[PDB]
Structure formats: C-alpha cells, structure tokens
C-alpha cells in the first residue's frame, strides 16, 4: 500500500472527488464523503448506515460471516454493524408504534402496582397472637427489663 492508496483529506475539487472515488473503488456518482466539519473523517466514503445482517445471505461473499467482498469499501462503523451487534433490519411493526406499546404496557403495569399497593387484598382476620408477651424473650428482648404485658383473651 502506497500513500496514494490511503485515506486523505476532505476532497475540495471535482478532480479530487473523482480521484477519491477511484481509490475507494466506487463510482464517482456513488461516492460521497462525510461533511467537512472538524471531526476527522477526511475523504473516507459515507456509506449507507445499514447492518451487515441486511445483506443478501445467498450471495457468494468472499467473507461469508461478515457478508463482505474483498476490496469493497468498508463502512466507517463496520465493527458496530457486524451480525453480532447492531441490526437495522426492517421490522414488521413500525419503530414508533413499537415504542408506544412497550412503554404504554410498562407504564400501565407500574400504575396498577401502585394502585394494588394502596388497596391491598387481605383476609377478614385479626392479628396473629403469640404467648409470653408476644415472645419478648425469644425475639431477643433484654431479660433484665420488663415488657408491658401483652394479654390475649379467649373469644
């Protein structure tokens, strides 16, 4: 690899754009660099922000696991778009609708748990009764002191 075949600065003139496209093995009509802010993209092509999962799995790829061909320009975020990471595939339900139903379901359940906490179910019974002043000694009470007696009567 020679320096002329390595990424360079943002292309300013149409001849540079035609030269950059050639270096990246692209049509000059398909080649578009990242916007020339000060972020450091240079002339590296901006390719569609699509996961490698979206590529045709029946094509005879040079790298079948990545679904990449040798010599094709790699997406800047290729390592984020491998099939083990971010998928951008179309979904049967619209993204916005999907968020409404998931959030709505969660919000409803959280509300109803507050309601059920404010209005608990219980049985029509009085408290459980324990002997020996509510088991004062067994629960660890100080032997040397004296609890106020807890008395339970028959009914």
């Amino acid at each position: 690899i020679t320096k002329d075949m390595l990424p360079g600065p943002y292309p300013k003139t149409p001849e540079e754009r035609a030269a950059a496209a050639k270096k990246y093995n692209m049509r000059v009509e398909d080649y578009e660099p990242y916007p020339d802010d000060g972020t450091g993209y240079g002339d590296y092509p901006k390719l569609p922000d699509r996961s490698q999962q979206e590529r045709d799995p029946w094509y005879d790829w040079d790298h079948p696991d990545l679904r990449l061909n040798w010599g094709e320009p790699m997406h800047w975020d290729l390592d984020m778009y491998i099939r083990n990471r971010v998928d951008t595939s179309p979904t049967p339900v619209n993204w916005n609708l999907m968020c409404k139903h998931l959030f709505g379901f969660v919000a409803f359940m959280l509300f109803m748990f507050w309601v059920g906490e404010t209005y608990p179910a219980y049985q029509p019974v009085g408290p459980k009764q324990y002997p020996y002043n509510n088991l004062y000694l067994e629960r660890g009470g100080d032997p040397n002191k004296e609890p106020e007696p807890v008395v339970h009567y028959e009914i």
Binding site: E138, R139, P143
Partner: protein, 170 residues
C-alpha cells in the same frame, strides 16, 4: 487439642433413640457399615503414623516478646526508640486483629449451634462481640493505610480531649 476456655462449647445433650416404628433404621446399619469400612481402616493407618511420630519427638516454641517502651515514652525524632515502640505497636495490632477474629468465631459458632433459638441463646456472645468491636474500632479505625503508633496516639489524644470536655461541662 485447643483450649476450651478460649473456644467454649456448651455441654452436649443428645436424646436417646426412642423408636416408635417396627421398620429398621437405615441410618443405624449405614452407621455400622461406616465404622467398619471407613473408620476402622482409617484409625489403623493413623495409629501407625502416630507410632512413627512417637519415635522422633521434638519441640517448637511460641515466641515471647518482652515489652519495650511505647511511643508515648519516645522523644521526638529519636528513631532508635520510635523504631522499637513502632514495631511493638505493629505486633499488638496484629494480635488485636486476631482477638476480634476469635470473638467473631465464637459468635458464628453459637449462631449455628443454637439453631432456631439462636436469637435468644447467643446474647452473651453478641454482647462480647459488640464490646470488642467497639474497643478495636476506637484503637485502630480511620488511621489509613500509612498507619503508625504516632497516628494511633494522636487519635487517642483527640478522643481523650473530647471525653474530658464532655465530662467537664457535664
């Protein structure tokens, strides 16, 4: 083997077998098989090993450290005295760590031994643990990684000053 005063154990009360079934107890026979197949051969091997040990009796000793003047008696910057006082303080620090460890072991043994009645029946051990942890915290807590006798003494004097102040105004 170990001092029972240091590591106390209440007297053990085992109930006697009082069966109310006509079926044989599978554990009893298994217990007998274990003593025959496992305990007896193991005891013979150990008894042979103890015979060899009895032929070659030799002794080791618990090192005894004489007391030396502590940091309070050391003149400022006198490294020769500070060094011996500092080494003694470091040894005592290690010993106090193990004293707390003994008390915690007593507390943990009591909790397991007393079962479901442990809350009422381990009050004495929980008290002793509470008091020793308080004393250990007073001596050694908050000194930092670069602790020393000098810093420990500074901590104590601050505590004595606060206790004097509270006592006086009271």
């Amino acid at each position: 083997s170990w001092d029972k005063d240091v590591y106390p154990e209440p007297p053990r009360r085992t109930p006697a077998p009082s069966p109310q079934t006509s079926l044989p107890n599978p554990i009893t026979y298994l217990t007998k098989a274990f003593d025959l197949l496992v305990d007896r051969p193991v005891t013979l091997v150990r008894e042979f090993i103890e015979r060899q040990h009895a032929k070659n009796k030799y002794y080791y000793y618990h090192r005894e450290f004489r007391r030396v003047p502590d940091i309070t008696e050391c003149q400022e910057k006198d490294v020769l005295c500070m060094f011996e006082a500092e080494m003694q303080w470091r040894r005592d620090y290690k010993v106090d760590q193990e004293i707390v460890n003994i008390i915690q072991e007593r507390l943990k043994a009591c909790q397991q031994r007393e079962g479901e009645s442990h809350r009422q029946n381990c009050a004495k051990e929980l008290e002793q643990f509470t008091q020793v942890v308080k004393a250990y915290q007073d001596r050694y807590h908050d000194l930092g990684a670069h602790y020393s006798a000098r810093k420990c003494l500074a901590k104590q004097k601050q505590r004595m000053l606060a206790e004097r102040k509270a006592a006086k105004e009271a």
